[PDB]
């Protein structure tokens, strides 16, 4: 489509006007409402305008991008209270959201690649500009050099596919099939880094911690899903070779999910534990993607949609304790039930959404993902039970130790909870239970 | 404000062993008369033994510690309101500065109490300037 | 007992004046709750058959009405007719990987 793109393009001059910070998120929620209205999509590409079109996977990912960026302007009031550069922050957020909409509504592989690697420069700018740590240089360089080092040979793979086929469109490239090892490694390993593996994760827990709240939303909300969207577009023509080489990645992802779930029990930071928590769920997503079933692909799309909300909502919760208690340390964050009792509703409602929860879309994504992985092999029942047990062994630890117990002595006086924060964590959880209603929307993209 | 000192005397060690032995004896024998009879028996056992020297007292103190570790009850009786009990610190009282973060319309429900708190704030800041200032 | 109107507790949106708090609070609650969560959910409740799942159920009921009347197959196992497809001969294939 072009309406949303030109809406953000004409929302670009809102940044240069003084005292215009809160109108931009109003117009962003308005264009999210308009994007809720334009929902006539089926499994093929619809609303074809030049090189821009949309199917159901692209619809869900653009809607998630708009919701995460609209809440990202709502979460960052620390940028508005200080005289930190609001115009540059708004311009970077609008440009980054426009690049995410352009790389998700891309009809072809190459424009997807171009806006996909254009998206990492505003994330770089947010991490090195608006963070609160001395190691922001260690944060952005790890992210950029990891993704760039594994995504440069993907361009050689992309033009090898173009030279063998002729076209760049997803449907015409779905017809062909390749039997090459190095083409498979080029077109897969960039997404295998962009979603967290066990071995290649390092950029993730050292880039989530040192970023701002907005870097945390944009990294754990939609930029762990660029790799998932890319693998959902690439795996269709590399089925024979991924069936040869998928047991290595699935075994590494499952053992790495168990091991990173064992890491989070030995983590002393709130923002680092959610950073490693993004590794464990996307390990289940990666293990269910390579089985190529209908249920694996549908449950992977459902779990990426339901994870981009819940991980970002958990990252807003660690920010509103970092703003008041002064540190992200888990030892300091103790007994917040007696400090902010009304926040503890949103802590447990968004920590339960990280595990299997009764009304959330995360359970409907996790059920449809464990179906495919148990269907893939019977040996995976040993390590899926361990991973899904350790997931709530660590995820209950963050709510339990931060929101229950004796109070941390020697804490100075801070402000109380605000209606903006309650609204911010309201919109990270009510989409998770209102989307099981009309769940055939957000699951059946095929 | 006397912070306790970590050195423990030998008489303090045997007094602590006597206290823990009678607490274990109270845990083992629930009836008060049988516990009293066994407590007088254990007191006579201590009182026939207090006339020895220091090194023999240290070695037999270690033997008594090993014996008390051997005969320790699996469910020792403890007071509920004290530390380590069944219902210790069931409620946690937050510090009073959150009362300073109430709404003024919420502060209007107890105006005499908040006026007394605002009066006490000046006394506390002069007391802190006297003490640590 | 009578609080001053100048001692006002801010909401989360602005910390400079009371006018920008109320306008941004009411407008942000307008663009999220009564547009994106209630009117949008009312739109998505009465959304038409974008996916053809209702049409699939109606066509399945009509097809199961008509297939068991003919009685050939409730579910057809073959994509095309077995007489229409021209299979290659055994000498034509040679050593080719036949997958089943």
């Amino acid at each position: 489509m072009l309406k949303i793109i030109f809406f953000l393009l004409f929302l670009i001059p809102f940044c240069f006007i003084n005292n215009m910070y809160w109108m931009v998120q109003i117009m962003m929620f308005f264009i999210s409402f308009i994007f809720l209205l334009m929902n006539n999509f089926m499994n093929y590409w619809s609303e074809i305008s030049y090189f821009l079109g949309c199917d159901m996977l692209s619809y869900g990912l653009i809607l998630l991008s708009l919701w995460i960026c609209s809440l990202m302007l709502l979460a960052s009031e620390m940028i508005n209270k200080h005289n930190n550069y609001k115009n540059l922050f708004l311009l970077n957020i609008i440009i980054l959201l426009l690049l995410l909409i352009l790389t998700f509504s891309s009809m072809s592989l190459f424009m997807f690649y171009l806006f996909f690697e254009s998206s990492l420069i505003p994330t770089l700018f947010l991490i090195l500009g608006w963070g609160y740590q001395p190691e922001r240089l260690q944060a952005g360089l790890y992210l950029l050099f990891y993704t760039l080092l594994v995504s440069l040979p993907m361009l050689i793979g992309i033009f090898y596919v173009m030279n063998k086929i002729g076209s760049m469109n997803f449907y015409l490239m779905n017809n062909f099939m390749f039997n090459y090892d190095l083409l498979y490694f080029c077109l897969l390993c960039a997404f295998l880094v962009k979603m967290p593996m066990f071995l290649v994760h390092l950029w993730l827990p050292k880039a989530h911690v040192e970023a701002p709240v907005s870097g945390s939303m944009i990294l754990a909300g939609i930029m762990l899903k660029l790799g998932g969207y890319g693998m959902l577009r690439v795996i269709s023509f590399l089925q024979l070779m991924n069936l040869k080489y998928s047991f290595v990645w699935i075994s590494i992802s499952l053992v790495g999910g168990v091991l990173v779930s064992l890491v989070c029990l030995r983590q002393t930071d709130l923002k680092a534990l959610i950073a490693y928590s993004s590794v464990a769920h996307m390990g289940i997503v990666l293990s269910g993607l390579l089985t190529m079933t209908y249920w694996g692909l549908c449950g992977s799309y459902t779990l990426m949609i339901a994870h981009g909300l819940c991980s970002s909502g958990l990252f807003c919760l660690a920010n509103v304790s970092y703003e008041r208690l002064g540190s992200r340390s888990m030892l300091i964050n103790k007994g917040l039930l007696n400090f902010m009792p009304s926040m503890t509703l949103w802590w447990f409602l968004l920590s339960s959404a990280n595990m299997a929860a009764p009304p959330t879309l995360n359970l409907l994504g996790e059920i449809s993902l464990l179906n495919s992985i148990v269907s893939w092999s019977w040996i995976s029942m040993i390590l899926l039970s361990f991973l899904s047990f350790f997931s709530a062994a660590y995820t209950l630890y963050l709510y339990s130790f931060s929101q229950h117990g004796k109070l941390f002595s020697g804490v100075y006086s801070f402000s109380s909870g605000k209606i903006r924060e309650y609204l911010l964590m309201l919109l990270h959880w009510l989409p998770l239970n209102l989307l099981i209603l009309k769940s055939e929307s957000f699951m059946l993209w095929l | 404000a006397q912070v306790p000192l970590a050195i423990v005397s030998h008489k303090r060690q045997v007094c602590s062993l006597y206290k823990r032995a009678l607490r274990n004896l109270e845990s083992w024998y629930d009836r008060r008369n049988v516990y009293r009879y066994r407590a007088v028996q254990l007191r006579a056992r201590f009182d026939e033994n207090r006339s020895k020297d220091l090194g023999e007292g240290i070695r037999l103190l270690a033997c008594g510690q090993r014996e008390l570790f051997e005969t320790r009850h699996f469910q020792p009786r403890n007071f509920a309101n004290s530390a380590g009990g069944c219902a210790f610190e069931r409620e946690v009282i937050p510090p009073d500065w959150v009362l300073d973060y109430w709404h003024p319309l919420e502060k209007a429900q107890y105006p005499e109490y908040f006026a007394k708190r605002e009066q006490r704030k000046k006394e506390f800041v002069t007391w802190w300037e006297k003490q640590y200032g | 007992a009578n609080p001053s109107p100048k001692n006002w507790q801010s909401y989360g949106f602005d910390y400079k004046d009371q006018v920008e708090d109320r306008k941004a609070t009411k407008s942000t609650f307008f663009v999220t709750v009564t547009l994106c969560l209630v009117w949008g959910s009312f739109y998505w409740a009465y959304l038409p058959d974008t996916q053809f799942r209702n049409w699939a159920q109606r066509e399945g009921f009509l097809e199961l009405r008509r297939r068991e009347l003919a009685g050939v197959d409730l579910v057809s196992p073959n994509y095309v007719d077995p007489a229409s497809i021209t299979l290659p001969s055994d000498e034509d294939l040679g050593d080719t990987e036949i997958i089943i």
């Binding site: 400090f339 902010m340 009304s342 209606i419 | 959150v98 | -």
Partner: peptide
């Protein structure tokens, strides 16, 4: 009637009424 030391619940109630 001893006065319990509770944090402020005005903002949560105003959020509930606005919602």
């Amino acid at each position: 009637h001893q006065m319990i030391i509770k944090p402020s619940r005005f903002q949560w109630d105003k959020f509930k009424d606005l919602l």
